[PDB]
């Protein structure tokens, strides 16, 4: 009686939302970008080859100085790389080898990681003893850790295999805010430039926009035919791309709340692993299971170029804050830099 | 020659780090990684107790071999999103409770719990991530199983089994049913063993099944097989 009433009402609200979205779809992004000149054939070459890992690499993140970067591999060690000289700065032994995510703090003072242990470990790099140590262990997730990103030296956002996402206070070590609503495992998240909003993708083929201060879902996005793995905010903070097992990247707009462009090719028979944007946002770089990475024109949706040189699936990607280089990681235990 | 005084010391630090990463890798390649699986009440507790958050790590040494067991039975998340992390383990230990032939799954609308364990075994065996990894099947609760079969026939689980309710025949039929799930018999082998709460001969069986796997993998790498 009341259950079916709530269900029909829900579907009525959803039809109303779909109609409201359609009402604003007067034109496609392709029609607007028709007059813009193409990007042309992109060319990038391997400038640095970083070795030292011995297992599958799963995560990597650039530092704010565009010179330092942290890499995570299931061999049990995190490595801080000097991308210019290739000299290792630190080697952090992991208490749990099965990590799948890593973050460099904006201040460069702390590093985070986690995985199947359901714990996010914070490592301090500026200890007076001259060695890295664990600052705090954030526990409370009922599932493997999927992604983590620093808001500040004391606040960090996290996502786990459990549908819940949480905002953590490092000083106290408790969840300041919890986010729920996903019907599937959350795989990745992306913080906005202003650090006031962030999006998260899950295996339910949906993406949700969250408010850090309030904690409510403001917008829900759909359109993917399979699990969403990667997600990245557009440099301006008004759009984000998502990568899926379906082999189709899609661009979503927040203000319009609709999909604007889809990036896919008939020869791509594999899913997406990582997504990133250039400093200008004109280039959309995505990692693919097929031992390569395609560069897509965000405006024209043309695959301008391809990056190759890995012997196994590309696990992670990252562009520097200055846009002078692009790092790539793969299960072959090698990390490379293009330019 | 073109480096400063401080830049020639960072190189030494990086070369000393590269020297400790390889020494640990050479220490992790001489160890046996064992993935542990099992359904509810599958006797996995007794197995781990006799042999010795999310992933649970248990380490032990038997006859100069260092083993590391990885219990993932507590991970309630999507298996296809983290099972690939264990690609390359030496072997997989699968625990099944024989007494489940008359116990329904948590969702009583579904098939028997033994059929659920069989489906899980089929899913984890015929997986693209473990086509080359062998499996070790421990059939738990044999003692109690021998008792219930006298009270409840085995046909409750297998309505097409035309045999006898004796312990030996029922156990052999269950073993055959579980072994027949191997769709890649030309590359994967299954080592079945019967265990109870009082038996302590499981670690030796694991040792033998791991030496056999190591021997066969060495022979295959050389291109002889």
């Amino acid at each position: 009686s009341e259950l079916d009433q709530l269900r029909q009402e829900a579907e009525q609200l959803k039809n109303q939302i779909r109609d409201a979205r359609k009402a604003c779809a007067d034109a496609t992004l392709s029609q607007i970008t028709n007059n813009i000149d193409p990007v042309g054939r992109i060319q990038m070459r391997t400038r640095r080859t970083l070795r030292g890992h011995l297992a599958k690499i799963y995560a990597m993140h650039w530092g704010t100085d565009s010179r330092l970067l942290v890499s995570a591999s299931q061999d049990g060690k995190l490595i801080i790389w000097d991308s210019y000289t290739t000299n290792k700065v630190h080697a952090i032994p992991l208490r749990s080898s099965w990590v799948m995510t890593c973050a460099y703090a904006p201040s460069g003072n702390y590093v985070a990681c986690g995985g199947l242990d359901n714990i996010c470990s914070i490592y301090n790099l500026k200890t007076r003893e001259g060695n890295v140590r664990v600052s705090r262990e954030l526990a409370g997730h009922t599932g493997y850790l999927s992604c983590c990103r620093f808001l500040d030296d004391n606040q960090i956002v996290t996502s786990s295999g459990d549908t819940t996402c949480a905002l953590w206070d490092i000083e106290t070590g408790q969840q300041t805010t919890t986010f729920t609503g996903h019907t599937g495992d959350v795989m990745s998240l992306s913080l906005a430039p202003d650090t006031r909003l962030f999006v998260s993708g899950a295996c339910d083929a949906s993406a949700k926009l969250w408010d850090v201060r309030e904690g409510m879902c403001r917008q829900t996005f759909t359109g993917h035919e399979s699990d969403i793995n990667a997600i990245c905010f557009f440099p301006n903070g008004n759009a984000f791309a998502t990568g899926s097992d379906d082999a189709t990247c899609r661009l979503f707009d927040l203000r319009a709340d609709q999909e604007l462009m889809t990036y896919s090719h008939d020869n791509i028979i594999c899913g997406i692993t990582s997504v990133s944007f250039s400093k200008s946002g004109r280039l959309l770089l995505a990692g693919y299971d097929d031992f390569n990475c395609n560069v897509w024109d965000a405006l024209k949706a043309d695959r301008a170029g391809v990056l190759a040189g890995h012997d196994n699936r590309v696990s992670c990607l990252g562009v520097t804050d200055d846009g002078m280089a692009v790092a790539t990681g793969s299960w072959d235990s090698f990390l490379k830099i293009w330019n | 020659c073109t480096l400063s005084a401080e830049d020639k010391a960072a190189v030494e630090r990086s070369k000393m780090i590269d020297r400790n990463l390889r020494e640990d890798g050479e220490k992790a390649a001489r160890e046996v990684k064992l993935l542990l699986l099992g359904a509810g009440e599958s006797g996995k507790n007794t197995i781990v107790k006799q042999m010795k958050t999310g992933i649970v790590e248990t380490h032990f040494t038997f006859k100069d071999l260092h083993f590391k067991m990885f219990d993932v039975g507590a991970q309630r998340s999507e298996r296809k999103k983290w099972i690939h992390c264990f690609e390359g383990v030496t072997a997989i230990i699968f625990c099944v409770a024989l007494s489940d032939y008359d116990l329904v799954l948590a969702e009583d609308e579904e098939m028997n719990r033994m059929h659920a364990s069989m489906k899980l075994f089929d899913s984890i065996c015929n997986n693209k991530w473990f086509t080359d990894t062998s499996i070790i099947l421990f059939l738990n609760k044999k003692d109690l199983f021998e008792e219930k079969i006298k009270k409840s026939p085995l046909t409750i689980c297998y309505p097409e089994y035309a045999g006898s309710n004796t312990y030996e025949e029922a156990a052999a039929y269950i073993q055959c049913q579980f072994e027949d799930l191997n769709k890649r018999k030309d590359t994967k082998e299954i080592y079945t063993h019967f265990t109870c709460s009082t038996d302590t001969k499981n670690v030796q069986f694991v040792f033998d099944a791991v030496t056999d796997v190591i021997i066969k993998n060495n022979l295959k790498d050389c291109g002889l097989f």
Partner: single-chain antibody, 233 residues
Framework: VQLVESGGGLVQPGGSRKLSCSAS????????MHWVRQAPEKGLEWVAY????????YYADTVKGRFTISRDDPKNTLFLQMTSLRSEDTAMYYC??????????????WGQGTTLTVSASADIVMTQATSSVPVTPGESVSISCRSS???????????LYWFLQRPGQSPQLLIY???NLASGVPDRFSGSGSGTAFTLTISRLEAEDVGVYYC?????????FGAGTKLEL
């Protein structure tokens, strides 16, 4: 973090003596160690250096062959053997830790040092612009120094260091690489340079800012210290 030097004492001319230092409160094996001695007259001079791992050692042309440096990482101890002691060897020897990685601050911690008494070149010369500067608390002070060679390396870093040895205390790192302020130092201290001439500014002179300021170049070995600028109250 603490360094305790020991082994000093009176020695005959041409004798031998072995100094020892023990580290605590930090990873001794990760830091490189230096020996710096202060003659009876205020002034510093580099003696020797041993890298992390005992893979690189350097000595000064004034003691090389006569002195020897060694370390014991399993016990976090440092040693300095001496032979054919000259009359000029009388000085208070200090132990200094130094770790070299991107963003590190070498010479960050100085020990108390021990005193030793003896019974009766393309080196980059660093010259400070003033030996003593009378100043009272409240106003700013600008110390200056000059280098006989361009310390600005092609990598972009200017290997200039500033130290402050308060009366009866050990030197303290103020600024490293001519642009980075050391940890624990207040914002009163700042520095700049054009490549050959450098300056150290101290705003709002407090009561714990008097003493001899020593400049040091780290472009290459040997390490050369300045003549010292004593801010007297």
């Amino acid at each position: 973090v603490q360094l305790v030097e020991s082994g000093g004492g009176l020695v005959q001319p041409g004798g031998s003596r072995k100094l020892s230092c023990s580290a605590s409160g930090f990873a001794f094996s990760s830091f490189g160690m230096h020996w710096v001695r202060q003659a009876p007259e205020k002034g510093l001079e580099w003696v020797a250096y041993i890298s992390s791992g005992s893979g690189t050692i350097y000595y000064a042309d004034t003691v090389k062959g006569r002195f020897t440096i060694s370390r014991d990482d399993p016990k976090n101890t440092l040693f300095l053997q001496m032979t054919s002691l000259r009359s000029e060897d009388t000085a208070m020897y200090y132990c200094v830790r130094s770790i070299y990685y991107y963003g590190s601050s070498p010479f960050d911690f100085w020990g108390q040092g021990t005193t030793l008494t003896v019974s009766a070149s393309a080196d980059i010369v660093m010259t400070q612009a003033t030996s003593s500067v009378p100043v009272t608390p409240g106003e700013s002070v600008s110390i200056s120094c000059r280098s006989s060679k361009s310390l600005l390396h092609s990598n972009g870093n200017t290997y200039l260091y500033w130290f402050l040895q308060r009366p009866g205390q050990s030197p303290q790192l103020l600024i490293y690489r001519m642009s980075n302020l050391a940890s624990g130092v207040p914002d009163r201290f700042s520095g700049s340079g054009s490549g050959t001439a450098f300056t150290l500014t101290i705003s709002r002179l407090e009561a714990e800012d008097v003493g001899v300021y020593y400049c040091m170049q780290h472009l290459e070995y040997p390490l050369t210290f300045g003549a010292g600028t004593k801010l007297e109250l």
